[PDB]
Amino acid sequence: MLFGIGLMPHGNPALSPEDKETEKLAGVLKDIGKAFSDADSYVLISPHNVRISDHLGVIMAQHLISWLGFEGVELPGEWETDRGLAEEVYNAWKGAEIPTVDLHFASRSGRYSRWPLTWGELIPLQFLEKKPLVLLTPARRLSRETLIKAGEVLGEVLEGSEKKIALIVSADHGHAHDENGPYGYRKESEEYDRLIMELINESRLEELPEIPDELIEKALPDSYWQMLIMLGAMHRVPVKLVESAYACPTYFGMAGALWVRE
Amino acid sequence: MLFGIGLMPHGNPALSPEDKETEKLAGVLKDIGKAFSDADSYVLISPHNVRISDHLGVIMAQHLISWLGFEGVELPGEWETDRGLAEEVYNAWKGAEIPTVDLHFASRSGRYSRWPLTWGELIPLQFLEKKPLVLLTPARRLSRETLIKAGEVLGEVLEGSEKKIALIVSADHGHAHDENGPYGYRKESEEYDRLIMELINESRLEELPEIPDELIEKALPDSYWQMLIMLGAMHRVPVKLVESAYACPTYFGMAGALWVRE
Ligand SMILES: [Zn+2]
Ligand SMILES: [Zn+2]
Ligand SMILES: [Zn+2]
Ligand SMILES: [Zn+2]
Ligand SMILES: [Zn+2]
């Protein structure tokens, strides 16, 4: 049963807000944590773990272990893979002809069956009560249609499970908001970010696939691909927006949003 | 140019020999290091990193970072990927219809482009002069034919490269050589190890694909799959055995072997 979806950022400021917009953002993330505290498991889609051009990753390793923070911000901790659910996701994707790989590491069981986590996962996880997880990774060379279809099949698996599951979508938006930022300034970053927030807030996420590659290439978001998977899941489980917040304290846009069962 | 091939173990005793057989093994491993000291890059096939059922992995991440030693033996260190060579291997496998994935992590380049190393890589690397590496991973659910073809295609890439390249195959053999080991004692471990050393020493590795599933299942080696890839490379680049050694100090077979161009 898919009882909620949380769109969560993976920027360090979310953990240490320095302005009122980022504080409101953190408030939403804390509310996501509260909303999902009675989940049995989480499914987490992250763009900053393993990245394959043309296959969606399903991590099978037993132990998910903090490894790589952003800009030296270490968030130590260990989570456990929900192996049964991970296998269900992988098998459903295989059956639906969605390109996917089953990712084990070192050993297939025991303490050596482990997989590294990065800030892409660790920052959202700071706000959530510890539960077993399935870590999934998007693939940027898959078509919009394939990503949406992957989300639909994912939603089927999560909804059909006897477990109460929350879907966590880790995503930051345009990365060129400041001339002094690492990607410099591009006006398209704000265009993308404002569009995403309108789609979220006005419950118009069905328009996500219509965003042209041109805007995406220029805006430099990380969010688009996993948000298409999210849209697919929303096709199978009616949800409603509870709240949302956007903040851009430095050079990149961050959003938090909570949807619950309608 | 494929300059040579080194079969190397990934057991802790190889780094700290406590008997004559293991000392002889370490000598061969040191000879491999010496023989390949003038190489430009290494290609390393390991069974204890990422493991996908049905796709060969090509690690693209820029920085290869020690993460997971075996049984407390940490071997800290950092290596760099030969990204140009890694791309050549991936592209050639794709072209030849060898199932393969391009494995990036966190970021496509720069500081966060990092991939974890385990004892499967770190132990052989202790014997080699530091050079850029391409890390590859076998897949145990691919057919013998596909694994051999993958090695043939790999051999062609390494041979056609302007660089002087050594292929390193990380491999331990049967794992049931001691009643007190994690798998107890099984005569099939001896049978498999004896056969592998026979095929190496008599230069009859062409017989590798004839080893029955039952023997492999009972002997519990990790070596078989990557040795089939190795065989494929030998198909394309004629090599000759220089030296070999076997040791089984604890519960698992280890071999070192050096082949150079015929
Ligand atoms: Zn990001
Ligand atoms: Zn409007
Ligand atoms: Zn595939
Ligand atoms: Zn091993
Ligand atoms: Zn014989």
Q: Any overview of this molecule?
A:
With 262 residues, the first copy, chain A, is of the alpha/beta class. In chain A, helix 2 (83-95) packs across helix 4, helix 4 (144-160) crosses helix 7 and helix 5 crosses helix 6. In chain A, strand 11 and strand 12 (254-261) form a beta hairpin. Chain A has helices at residues 20-35, 83-95, 119-126, 144-160, 187-201, 213-219, 224-236, and strands at residues 2-8, 41-45, 50-51, 56-59, 63-68, 78-80, 100-105, 114-118, 133-137, 165-170, 239-247, 254-261. Chain A has one domain (1-262): Protocatechuate 4,5-dioxygenase, Chain B. In chain A, strands 7-4-9-2-10-1-12-11 form an eight-stranded mixed sheet, sandwiched between helices. In chain A, strands 6-5-8 form a three-stranded mixed sheet. It is classed as oxidoreductase.
Topology:
Two copies of one chain form a homodimer.
Chain A: E1 2-8, H1 20-35, E2 41-45, E3 50-51, E4 56-59, E5 63-68, E6 78-80, H2 83-95, E7 100-105, E8 114-118, H3 119-126, E9 133-137, H4 144-160, E10 165-170, H5 187-201, H6 213-219, H7 224-236, E11 239-247, E12 254-261
Parallel strand pairs in A: 1-10, 2-9, 2-10, 4-7, 5-8
Antiparallel strand pairs in A: 1-12, 4-9, 5-6, 11-12
Helix pairs in contact in A: 2-4, 4-7, 5-6
Bound molecules: zinc ion (5 copies).
The site of one zinc ion has 4 residues of chain B, from loops.
PDB class: oxidoreductase
Keywords: Putative, Dioxygenase, oxidoreductase
Assembly: dimeric
